[PDB]
Design a protein around this ligand. Structure first.
Ligand SMILES: O=c1[nH]cc(F)c(=O)[nH]1
Ligand SMILES: O=c1[nH]cc(F)c(=O)[nH]1
Ligand SMILES: O=c1[nH]cc(F)c(=O)[nH]1
Ligand SMILES: O=c1[nH]cc(F)c(=O)[nH]1
Lengths: 224, 224, 224, 224
């Protein structure tokens, strides 16, 4: 059923890459998913998993072939990545991915976007934002652990687009998604790329994925 | 070329586990092999590459299965890793990987084995060792980044078998190997697992792998 | 003249703790005060200094004596810390410090506060906040790299106080201050402690500290 | 008692540098000294202390003045550290300190020296060494957590001197020392510098420092 669900997302949206479901990724997901998990532990594995997710997403950047010469003085043919990029996090749950992103891309520029779903309706509203100036010319690693309704990421995307970011240069990095948020995301912005660790089954009346993980941001920041 | 070699090696040696040759992987490999790379950059990228490799490798241990219930108060079918392990680094080069093991496995016990081959005779002698008392009952991640002749890792496997470690409980973690190294290891110890990041074409007259990386230990620690 | 400002500040405000001015500490500040330093470098050293700075601030927590016995089976007279604490960051600049608090306090609870000065006038207004539930009972490490006029940091405290946090349980962690701000902080909230690394002589019309460091937040996040 | 102690040595040996005995340090020492603290923790806290210890030693190096210009387009008179350095670990316990060193000094060259006391004679002898080719041109941070009798470090020093390093250019970085140890190092190489974090009362009948911490290397690497 998971299977059947993984593959359908997969045969269905060529734009998503599903991180390889190794025994290890699964163990990590287990610890994180578990309610019994203390904060010290949760942060540790959450951080552990995030480095892996990023390392994977980084493969969507573009690269050229580069050839070098070894100390043995022979030629090796490889590649290099030349793109200007930056990471944008959606406050606050997205903030927990910055570190991972910064651990591998030393000094990478970081934008932050604050979105709040309206009280009356629940239309999502852009509250605050600080983005690199020339973000129009960069590839963007859009950071957000959970993808329920996709309400927020979609808003985030709306704004990035507004500023001139090309849809095709946006890499949505995520941990846990819902078939439904996946669908809305590609229905509005088919050109984006989305890299995820996991797809769960359904969404709750409170719009929490399930089986899910609970409130990620509170769990990670300890604002339980 | 490389694809063939890769295929055959993969075909005659089923306990080899070559890492996913992603574009990021290659790129790291690219910077690490370059003769011009400054020491600070070499180290930084080695560690990065190293972290991914350890993560690959941990997938070789046995894992339980575990059902957990989430904050959504429903259950999750996870997995848990229940074995007892340790890291054994082959001094000095293998030491470069310890940190990576420790980054992912906090407090993991670490054993060290200094093998050195004799000046005239050229043979590997055991010169220094300091291991965990119960290594007999553990899974060992043997760490040594280069594998050319397999001359020394073979001596390290021998002493571990004399302390009573099970052969099939040894996981040999490596960055770069030569086909000949591979053949040897598996000829003497068919029951080990080996996880590697790259397999080079062959070795030169001086028994250095090529196109290779040079002297890993020397480039990592700064003694050349 | 530095000394002169350092001491006059030091004798007037019993509650401020200045870090010992070491050649290395000054070497870090030199690098980060300089306009020519690259993002990757600025971030490195800012992270470096921050860690020393928290380590310092943490000695303002209360601790009990504890006696243990050494592996030698002789007793040693320790001094355990045991109070509940949490860090609270002032978005955005302050957030650069949480990583340091987390480096040293595994899974420490983190609270975020977003305050924006008011356009027409100039009063700092609470834009958004997310704190631990039981914060009234914790000691708080309030983080904000800079302290010009102190408006923002007098607002964050105001809200803290209203949430019930006891004033003498608040530790203000700061890299750089202007006397002026140091003055408003204590006139308003005499009972709180402030730990800082440097005090600069003056403030400019745009409210920047001089010779100071420029806009900390953007140089660290690279939105400059 | 202890105070009479730090007093005599600080008085008799002008090149010793004890770190500030702050509450946390004590606290830290308290956890690492306890016989019931588990491996994961012992390492976490040892690393934490070691990092402060190294920041401290880094101050022993020569430094230049440097005036920079801040973004406020004004001058700042900093300092800069210009010497060539490298760390040299006394294998195996000294190895635990490399990481600290490498966390603050990226890419520093690291030399290693393994010295053992003969099984019968007790004489300490050089067993293995790999060091930067130009160590004589550098300032040496010598790490060894423990200094009892000082047999080991004295021998270490001796080989660096045979290699040509300047006695005055060696900074001996230590976690715990016994008076006997200090007096010996000084009688023998009065020109070196020693930065330590604590000085214990004495040696057991068996040559262990008390109250001590026991075998560091074993508690650190997990060989206990
Ligand atoms: O933090 C969360 N956001 C959205 C979700 F659907 C969920 O489970 N958790
Ligand atoms: O460090 C190394 N040892 C052996 C080799 F063959 C090689 O290439 N590198
Ligand atoms: O980042 C900064 N903002 C405001 C200041 F006054 C200052 O010195 N730095
Ligand atoms: O590990 C140790 N080495 C040397 C000592 F003197 C001691 O007490 N502990």
């Amino acid at each position: 059923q998971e299977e059947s669900i993984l593959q359908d997302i997969i045969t269905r949206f060529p734009n998503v890459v599903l991180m390889k479901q190794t025994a290890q990724l699964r163990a990590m997901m287990t610890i994180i998913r578990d309610k019994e998990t203390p904060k010290e532990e949760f942060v540790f594995y959450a951080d552990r998993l995030i480095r892996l997710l990023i390392e994977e997403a980084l493969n969507e950047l573009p690269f050229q072939k580069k050839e070098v010469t070894t100390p043995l003085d022979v030629s090796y043919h490889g590649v290099s990545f030349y793109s200007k990029i930056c990471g944008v996090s959606i406050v606050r749950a997205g903030e927990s991915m910055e570190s991972g992103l910064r651990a591998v891309c030393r000094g990478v520029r970081i934008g932050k976007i604050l979105i709040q779903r309206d009280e009356t309706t629940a239309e999502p509203k852009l509250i605050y934002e600080k983005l690199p100036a020339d973000i129009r010319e960069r590839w963007v690693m859009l950071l957000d652990p959970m993808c329920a309704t996709a309400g927020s990421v979609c808003k985030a995307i709306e704004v990035l687009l507004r500023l001139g970011v090309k849809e095709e240069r946006i890499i949505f990095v995520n941990i846990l998604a819902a078939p439904q948020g996946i669908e809305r995301v590609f229905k509005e912005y088919p050109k984006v790329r989305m890299v995820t660790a996991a797809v769960d089954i359904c969404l709750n009346s409170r719009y929490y994925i399930v089986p899910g993980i609970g409130d990620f941001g509170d769990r990670y920041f300890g604002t339980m």
